[PDB]
Amino acid sequence: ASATRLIQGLRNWASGRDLQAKLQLRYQEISKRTQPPPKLPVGPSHRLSNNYYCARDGRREAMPPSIVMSSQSEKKAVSPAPPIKRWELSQDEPYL
Amino acid sequence: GVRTSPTGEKVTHTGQVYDDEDYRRVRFVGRQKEVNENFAIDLIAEQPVSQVGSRVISCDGGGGALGHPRVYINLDKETKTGTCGYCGLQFRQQH
C-alpha cells in the first residue's frame, strides 16, 4: 500500500490487473484483536418445563437393523432408489 | 517453605528428595534440580479464615465461572473451620 504511483502503475500494467483494489497484504480493514465479550445463545433444550429427556433422546430411539430376509406373483422389479436425475448445465457459467 | 537435604538437594513440595546413596542424583550433576518454590500448602495457610453469618456458605473459588464448581460448606462445627475441598479457603460461622 506504501508503493509509489510509478511502481503502482508499473505493477498494475505488468500483472494486467488492478492490484491495489485487492491487496493480499492486510491493513486496518481486518477485525480488532480485542473484542467485546459475547453472549452466546442456548439450545432448544434449555427449557425449565416440557423438557423431559425421554422425549428428546436420540440414542435410545436407535433400533436394531430390521431383518428383511433371513435363513432363520408378477411383482415389479425394483431399484434401490429411483434413477438419478440428469444434472442441469449451469445457467451461471456453462463454458459453452 | 522449601528446605534442603543433607546432600544439598532441595526437597519438593511433595517431599521427594533422592537419597545419599542413590545414583540418580547424577542427572543433576553439572545441572540443576528444578523445584517450585511456591508451596501451595504454605500459601493457602496464609489466608484469613473468613467469618460469615450463615449456617451454610457457598464457595466457587472466586471469579464466577473461572473458579471451581460451586460447593456448599456446613459450618456447624465450632471446633473446626469449614474448608473448601476444591480451593482450600476456609470459613467460620461468626456466632
Binding site: 494486467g16 490487473r17 467485546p36 465479550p37 459475547p38 453472549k39 452466546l40 445463545p41 457459467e93 | -
Partner: protein, 43 residues
C-alpha cells in the same frame, strides 16, 4: 445475545469467476511489428 453474525444487509458480492482479461495486440499486428523491425534492421 452477542454472536458472530453477518451484517444486516449481508456481506458484499464476492467475485469468483475467471478474469484473464485479454491484453496485447492482434496476431496481424504482432507480425507487422516484427516485419517492420526486420525491415528497419535490414535497411
Amino acid at each position: 445475545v452477542k454472536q458472530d453474525m453477518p451484517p444486516v444487509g449481508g456481506y458484499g458480492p464476492i467475485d469468483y469467476k475467471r478474469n484473464l482479461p485479454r491484453r496485447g495486440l492482434s496476431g496481424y499486428s504482432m507480425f507487422a511489428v516484427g516485419i517492420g523491425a526486420l525491415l528497419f534492421g535490414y535497411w
